[PDB]
Amino acid sequence: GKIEEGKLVIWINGDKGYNGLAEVGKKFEKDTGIKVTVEHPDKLEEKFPQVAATGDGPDIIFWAHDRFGGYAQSGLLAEITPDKAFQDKLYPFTWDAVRYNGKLIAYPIAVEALSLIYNKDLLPNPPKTWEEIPALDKELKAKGKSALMFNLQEPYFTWPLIAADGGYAFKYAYDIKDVGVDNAGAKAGLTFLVDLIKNKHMNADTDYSIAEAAFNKGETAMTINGPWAWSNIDTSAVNYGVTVLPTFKGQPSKPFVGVLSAGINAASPNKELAKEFLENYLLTDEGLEAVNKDKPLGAVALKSYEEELAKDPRIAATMENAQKGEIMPNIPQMSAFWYAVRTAVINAASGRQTVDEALKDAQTGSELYRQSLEIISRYLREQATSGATSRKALETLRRVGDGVQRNHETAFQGMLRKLDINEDDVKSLSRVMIHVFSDGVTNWGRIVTLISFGAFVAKHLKTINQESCIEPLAESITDVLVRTKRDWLVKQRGWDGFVEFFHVSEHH
Amino acid sequence: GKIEEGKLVIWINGDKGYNGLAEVGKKFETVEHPDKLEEKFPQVAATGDGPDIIFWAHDRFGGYAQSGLLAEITPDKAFQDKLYPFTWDAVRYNGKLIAYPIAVEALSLIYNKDLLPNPPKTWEEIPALDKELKAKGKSALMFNLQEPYFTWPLIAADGGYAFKYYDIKDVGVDNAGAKAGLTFLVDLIKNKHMNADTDYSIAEAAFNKGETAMTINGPWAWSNIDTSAVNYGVTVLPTFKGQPSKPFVGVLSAGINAASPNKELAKEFLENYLLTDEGLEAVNKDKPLGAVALKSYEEELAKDPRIAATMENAQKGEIMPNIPQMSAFWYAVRTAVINAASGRQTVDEALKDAQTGSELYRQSLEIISRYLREQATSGATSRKALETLRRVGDGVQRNHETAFQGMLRKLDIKNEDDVKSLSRVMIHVFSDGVTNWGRIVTLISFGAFVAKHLKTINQESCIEPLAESITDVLVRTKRDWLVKQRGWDGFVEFFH
C-alpha cells in the first residue's frame, strides 16, 4: 502492499532536524510538484522492518548505518546506484559504513559521535578523566549542583566508558564469534558507572529528558550527547563547550560512531523520485544547511558543506571523539547486541543484576544469533544432503529432530502441500515464521519442532533443486528465534540448556 | 508469592510530598516515586507484584478496580465521618470504596505580584499583556502545554466535557467550544506569546526565576515558589469568552493492591497514621496537598488565601470521572493538544481524532460484544454499526464457512487464556499486512463463528471474554488507522 505513488513518505527520528528536512520537501514540491511527507514515528527502527516486509511503510527511512544491515539482509532496501561523480562528492569512510555484502544499501548523510558537553560558567576547565568526577560532584553538590548527568537508559551513551579499558561488539576481520561485552575492561567501565550511582554522583533513572533538562536549567556541569542536542542548549542560554570525552584508566572513551543514512524501501514505486530528493536536493550545501539549522548533523558526508562547517569547535571535538571511538558494525545482529547491552546496563544501574551477571547474559544474547544459525543451518544442510555446545546440540538435534520428523511426517507433509513449495520465487514468502510464538509461550519442545519442520522443508528444497535456499530458511528460523525469545533463551543457559533438556528426557 | 510481607511499599508521584509521607513511614516503623507509575501499577499488579499502596488522583482508580487490582477498603463510620462526603463519592466505583481520599487538587492562576499587581481576569487580554512585558525581556504566561491537565481549563470554558453525569457515550471533545479554546491556545503559540515545547520544568523555572508574570499550577508547586521568594499570588483562572475556565478537580487517593498480603497493615497506616492532623501536616509541609479530605485539618488550613482560590477554581471546574475510559480520553486529548500546538494537525482534525480516541474502546466492546451474544442467542453510531455488522458479518460467515470451520477445528478453546491466545493469533491471520474494513469485519465475523461454537459446546460463559479479547487486539494494533477512519462512523459510511 500500500505505498502511495507520485509522493514521498520519509521517516526520520524525532531527535534529528525533521522540520529542516520538511523545508527541503517544500522546495522539491515547488520544483518537481511531488508531495513530500516527513514523519517522526516512535520506535520507527522497529516499525520499518515489520511494515516493509508486508510491502507497506515509508518511501525513505532515516537511521544510523548500524540498523540498515538487518534491513538489507531481509531484502527491505533498494540497492542504491550512484554515479562515481556523486560517490567522489562524499567521503569514502561514509560509503564503507553504508555498504553490506558489497552492496550500497543507503545514502550517507552525516557522521555522529558523543562529546563531553560542559557549562563553561560552572566548569571553566572540565575534567580530562572519569576517575576525578566523584571528587568534582562533592564540590558542585555543596553549591546545589551536580558534575555529570546523561542518558543511562540507552546503551549508546554508556558504551564510551564500557569500551574504554576493553570492550567491543564484534571484532573486525566482522568476527560474529568474537564478542567483547563480558570481558574485564567492560566490567571495569560498567563497575565505574554503577559506583557513581551507588555513591549518589548519578541516579539509575536518569534518561535523555532528565539530563537535557538539568544541563539546560544549569543544574549539572556536564552531559554526554551528540550534535542533534546543540539547538536545544543554544535556546537555553547556558554558555556551553563541546570537548573530548573523559579518559578511563588513562585510555580514551570509545563512543560508537553513527552515520545518519537514508535508505529506500524495496517496495517503493517512487525509487526514481527518492534518488532525486536525496542526491540533488538533500546532500547539497543549501539542502544540508536547512536540516543542520533545525538540528546539527555533525560532520556531513558531503565533502563541500563539511569544508564550510569544519571551523566549528563543536564539530572538531565530535570528530576528535570519533578518532578515539570505533564505527558501528551494520551486520544484522547489531540489534540483538544493543537490546542485550541495554538490559545489562539498566539491570546493573538498578542493582537487579550484579555487573558480572548482567554483562554475562548480554554476552550470551549477542552470541546467540551466530551459534543458533551454526546449529540450525548445519542440521538443515545435513538433513537435505567446532563448538563444544554446538557439537552436543547438533548431536541432540539429530536424535530428537529426526524423531519429531518421523512421528509428525503426515502433519508435516500436509503443511508442505499447503505452502505449495514449486520454485525459488515461491520460497521468497518466509513471513510464515514471523508469528510462530503468537500465543506468547516458549518451550524447547516448540523450538525443536520448529527446527524439525525447517529440516523437513530443507529436504524438500534439495528435491526441488533449490539447495541454495536452505541457508535463508535457517537464517529466517534463527531470526524469529533470537528476535522474539532472546531473554528466555539466555535465561535457559541458551543452547547448553537445550542439550540438558533432552539429555534428561532420554536417560529418564 | 511476589509482594513482600511484614513491609509496606508505597508509590506516590514525585510532584507530591513523598519525603513528608516517608516521615510518617518512620513514625509507623518503603516510599518510592517511580516514573510512569500509573501505567506500571496495572501491569505489575496483574502478575501479582507491585506496591502495597498506590497514590494517584481518583481518575485512574476506576480502571484499576474494574480490572480487580484494588482491595475493597473497609472503614469505620467514625472514619467516614472524619472526611468530607464529596471526597468519598470521588473514591467510589460500582458502589464500592476503592481507595482512601486525601486532598482536593485544582489548578489556579499563579502570578508575580511585583511584575503584575492586578493580573488579567480574561484570556483574551493576555496577547496584549505579552507585547507590554516582552519589551522588558519578560513574558505574560508560561505553563505545561505537554499535559492536557493544564490545557483543559481553556478548552472546557466555551464548551467541553469528558462525560455527562457517567454517560460513557456522551463525550464533548469535538465541540465548537473546545475548538475556540484550543484555537486560542494555538494562536498564542503562532503569535510567539507561548512556545509549543514548554513543559512543567520550563514553566516552573521561568516563574520561579522571575522571567514570566503568570503560571498555571496546583498546590504541590507552592513549596518551590516559596524557596524562589518571588512575591506570588494565587487567584481565579482567566475567563474565556466570559465563561469561567473549568479545571479538572483531582482527589489524591491511596489504594491497596488486591495482591498485597499486608492489606491490614496498609489500612492502619492510612487510617491511624496518615489521615490525622499531625500526619497530613508532614506531607503538606513538604508539598501542599490543597484542601485535605480530613475536615479537621481542612478547618485549620481553610484560612490560606491560596487554598481559598484553589477551591474557588474547583467550584467553576468539574470533578474527574473515575470510569476506566478516562485513561483513553487523557491519551487522545494529550495528542490533540500537542499536534495542534505543533501544527502537525489543524484544531478540527486534532479535536475530531481525540473525540474518536476517547470513545473507541467502549464503542468497539459494545458493538463486538452485542454482535457475538446476538449471533449465539455513540449509541446512534453503535446501533447503525451493529445493524451493518448484522447484514455484512452474516454474509462474511456464509462466504468464509470452509476456511472458518478448518480454523475452528484446529483452534479448540478450553479456558479464558485459550480465548486470549485465539485473539492474538486472529489479528495476525486475518490482517496479513494491511488494515481495511473488510479484514476487520472478517476478524469480527470469525469471532461470531467461534461465539456460536461456544454455545454449541456448552461454554456460553467464554463469549464475553472473547469479545473483550478481540476488542483488546483490535484497538491495540489498529488504534491509529481506526481513529484516522473516524472510527465506527467510517465503518457505517464504508458499507452504505
Partner: peptide, 13 residues
Amino acid sequence: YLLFWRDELILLX
C-alpha cells in the same frame, strides 16, 4: 503463518 497451538505446529490460513 506457521503457529503453535498447545505444542502443535499448525499452518493457519
